Every structure is written in structure tokens, then in C-alpha cells.
Design a protein around this ligand. Structure first.
Ligand code: HEC
Ligand SMILES: COc1cc(C=O)ccc1O
Length: 403
């Protein structure tokens, strides 16, 4: 469509999944708002355009097409107006900072210890599978009321939901190129229903302190609950991004710290710097890289593009967090970067609802990890592969330490 961007026609999904940064660097210089054929959508790549689209009164939330096929309605990420306000009201109580501070430490710290105890004396570990992901899912799972769902199962569900919700590739007719990729999303949803429908059955008659029970009961007239079909899409949104991203964020922070060994040493010596290390990790490899979207409600002009009403725009926050108009050498992890704003949690009315919770989950897990294994070192004989365009993180993180 845009003639000087004809090279975009040769960009593939695989290339974006394996490393999107080269394409998006060109996009930030050539076309901060650009239609990307394989994605079938306009894409916002700079911090200015992302921030503008995310906060504009001329835009409302929309779900990406593969996200919609995966989550259905009403996914909190893709609804507006009254439904959105109800769902925000539904999820916000356990995420309130004053509430998180009451219990986050007794929640996450014993969990981190239980997983650290399985390997802290081995001298080698794969931290993604053995620590980062389990701590992340076990923490949220217990908060939700999924105490009896195994870590390994929560991790399998978010991986399947991941691949389904990012199955974004379209052919030249605008149709999904790989419709089979939605099947494992459908299978994960089916397993989730078989496991969670009995829990909802119980919570409806016997409410408890689990978050999902509060989603059913909070703000409802006496004897009434929100219909399960009304809350399931948001349960799926949790069982993907809320389960996956704090694991991705702490693992990416570790990889960044390993890439700067004197900063890693500084953080191990002074664990009060862990929150600053995590914030730079989120900027350096944003866990939610390009999975949120908005849609114009009016005709709008963004970055010299005139958009008709009803135009979706994907927000590639992960690219915006490497904006060289904001940062010096963004592809380099640097703990001592000035604490500038970043977009790893989004912006506007649909900005992440779990920021305060997530930052504490990541802080505590890194605290316990560095105290258990202060001589942690990356295994230089293994490579670290980052994967993902919609959600991005390291596929594994092999480490060693002298025992
Ligand atoms: C306990 C729940 C929870 C956790 C954990 C969580 N999130 Fe959020 N996040 C949400 C919810 C709910 C939304 C949807 C907000 C909405 O659409 O109103 C969201 C939305 C987002 C968005 C989209 C915002 C936008 O502008 O469209 C981003 C980006 C995001 N989260 C990043 C993260 C990152 C990064 C982490 C972890 C490091 C994380 N999330 C962990 C609950 C969570
Ligand atoms: C916080 O969970 C999710 C967030 C997003 C934001 O774009 C997309 C899918 C998810 O499951």
C-alpha cells in the first residue's frame, strides 16, 4: 500500500517472532505508524505514537484479531464503557497497593524458597523452567484460588494461550494464514473449563478469599453472582499474560544483568537496587512486546497517516521502549540509565492493572535468588534465545555456580 514501505511485504511472522528489533528500528525511522501486511494491521512503533494512541480520546480498546479468536468476549483488554468499568472494578481490589502490601511477602517469599530449595545446591539450573515461571504462576495461582493446579499445568496453559493469541499471520487475502494454531488455544481453554467450572460451582455457594470468588461476588446484589461466561475471558487473560509476564520480566532482567557483570555484582551486593534493575529489564525486553491494540472511533491523523474511523492499531510497546528519541543505546541493558518513563505496562485507561503486584513478585523472586546463590553466573557454553513478537522473553536461562 505505502510505496516506499514495499519491503514490509517481505517481512515474515517467523522473522518478527525471532527478533523484531531490526524491522521495528526501520519502522521507527521510516513510518512510526505503518501497515504491516503479515500482521494485517497498522502498527505503532515509537514512544510518541504508542503513548498518543493509548491515551487518545479518539481511540478505544480493541483486541488484536488473534487475541479475539483466542479470548472471545468480554476480554477486559478488548472492551470499553460500562463492561470495561465493571471488569476493572472486578479485578482491582486484590491489586490495590495498600492491599498487596498486606500479604505479598508471605505469598511470594515462601514460594520462591520452595522452588530454590529444589536446585540451590545443584550448581546448575535452567532458571526459566526451574524458577522464574513457577514462582510467577504459583504466586498468581494461589492468589486466584488455583492452589490445586500444578505449576507445570499453569505453565503449559499460558504457553498454549501464548501461541494462539499471537497466531497473527495473515495471507494476502487478509485471512489467518495458520488457523490450526488456534486449536491448542481451544484445547487449553477446554482443560481450563474442566478444572475451573467445579471451582466456580463451589465459590458460588461457598465464597472464600480467593480472587476468582471475589470476581463472582463483589458488588453483586444479595445471592447473585456474575455469570461465569461473563468472567471467563478475563480468566483467560490472566492465565496468559498475568501468569507469564512476571516470569518473563525477571528472567529478562537477569539476562540483562549478566550482560553487564559489574552491574550484576552491584545488585547482588545491594539488593535495594533490584527494583531499579527490574524497571530497566522491562524496558530492555518488554514482556508484553506487541499484544495490545486500540481502534479509532473518529477519523484521525497520526504521524502523517490519515486513519479512517474504525482502524485498529497494534501498540508495539516493546519497540517503543527502544525509541532512540528517548534513550541512548537502548539495545544495551544499563541499570544506571536515568529512571525515565517507559511503556512496558502500557498507558491510559487500559494500562496494566497489576503493576504493583507484578513488580513485587519480580522483586521478591530476585531477592531470594540472589541471597540463595550470590555467586550466580551465566553458563557461557549455552546461548540465550529470546522468542516472541506479541509476548517476548528468553526461552531458557542456563546458569552455574561454584558449589
Ligand atoms: C495480577 C494481574 C496482572 C499481572 C501479574 C500483570 N498484569 Fe499487566 N494487565 C493486567 C490487566 C487486568 C490488564 C488489562 C487492563 C485493561 O485492559 O483495563 C493488563 C494489561 C497490560 C498491558 C496492556 C496495557 C495497554 O495499554 O493496552 C500491558 C503492556 C501489561 N499489562 C504489561 C504487564 C507486564 C509487563 C507485567 C509483568 C511484568 C504484567 N502486565 C503483569 C493484569 C496483570
Ligand atoms: C495481562 O494479560 C494479558 C494482557 C494483554 C495486553 O496486551 C494481552 C493478553 C493478556 O493475557
Amino acid at each position: 500500500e505505502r510505496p516506499d514501505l514495499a519491503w514490509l511485504d517481505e517481512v515474515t511472522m517467523t522473522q518478527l517472532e525471532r527478533n523484531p528489533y531490526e524491522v521495528y528500528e526501520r519502522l521507527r525511522a521510516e513510518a512510526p505508524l505503518a501497515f504491516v501486511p503479515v500482521l494485517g494491521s497498522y502498527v505503532a512503533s515509537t514512544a510518541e505514537v504508542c503513548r498518543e494512541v493509548a491515551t487518545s480520546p479518539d481511540f478505544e480498546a480493541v483486541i488484536t484479531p488473534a487475541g479475539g479468536r483466542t479470548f472471545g468476549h468480554p476480554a477486559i483488554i478488548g472492551v470499553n464503557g460500562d463492561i470495561h468499568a465493571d471488569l476493572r472494578s472486578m479485578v482491582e481490589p486484590a491489586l490495590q497497593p495498600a492491599e498487596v502490601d498486606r500479604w505479598i511477602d508471605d505469598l511470594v517469599r515462601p514460594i520462591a524458597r520452595r522452588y530454590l530449595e529444589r536446585f540451590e545446591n545443584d550448581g546448575h539450573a535452567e532458571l526459566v523452567a526451574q524458577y522464574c515461571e513457577p514462582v510467577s504462576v504459583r504466586s498468581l495461582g494461589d492468589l486466584l484460588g488455583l492452589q490445586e493446579v500444578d505449576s507445570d499445568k499453569l505453565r503449559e496453559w499460558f504457553a498454549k494461550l501464548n501461541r494462539s493469541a499471537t497466531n497473527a499471520a495473515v495471507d494476502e487475502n487478509g485471512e489467518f494464514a495458520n488457523p490450526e494454531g488456534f486449536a491448542e488455544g481451544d484445547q487449553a481453554k477446554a482443560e481450563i473449563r474442566a478444572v475451573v467450572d467445579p471451582l466456580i460451582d463451589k465459590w458460588i455457594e461457598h465464597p472464600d478469599d480467593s480472587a476468582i470468588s471475589h470476581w463472582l461476588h463483589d458488588g453483586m446484589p444479595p445471592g447473585q453472582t456474575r455469570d461465569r461466561e461473563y468472567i471467563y475471558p478475563t480468566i483467560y487473560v490472566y492465565l496468559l499474560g498475568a501468569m507469564q509476564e512476571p516470569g518473563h520480566g525477571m528472567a529478562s532482567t537477569l539476562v540483562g544483568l549478566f550482560s553487564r557483570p559489574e552491574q550484576l555484582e552491584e545488585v547482588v551486593d545491594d539488593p535495594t537496587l533490584i527494583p531499579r534493575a527490574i524497571a530497566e529489564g522491562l524496558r530492555w525486553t518488554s514482556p508484553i512486546w506487541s499484544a495490545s491494540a486500540r481502534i479509532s472511533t473518529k477519523p484521525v491523523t497520526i504521524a502523517g497517516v490519515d486513519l479512517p474511523a474504525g482502524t485498529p492499531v497494534m501498540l508495539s510497546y516493546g519497540s517503543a521502549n527502544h525509541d532512540t528519541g528517548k534513550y541512548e543505546a537502548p539495545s544495551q541493558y544499563d541499570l544506571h540509565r536515568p529512571p525515565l518513563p517507559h511503556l512496558a505496562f502500557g498507558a491510559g485507561n487500559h494500562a496494566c492493572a497489576g503493576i504493583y503486584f507484578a513488580n513485587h513478585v519480580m522483586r521478591i523472586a530476585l531477592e531470594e535468588l540472589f541471597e540463595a546463590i550470590p555467586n550466580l553466573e551465566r553458563d557461557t557454553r549455552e546461548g540465550v534465545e529470546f522468542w516472541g513478537w506479541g509476548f517476548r522473553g528468553p526461552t531458557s536461562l542456563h546458569v552455574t555456580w561454584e558449589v
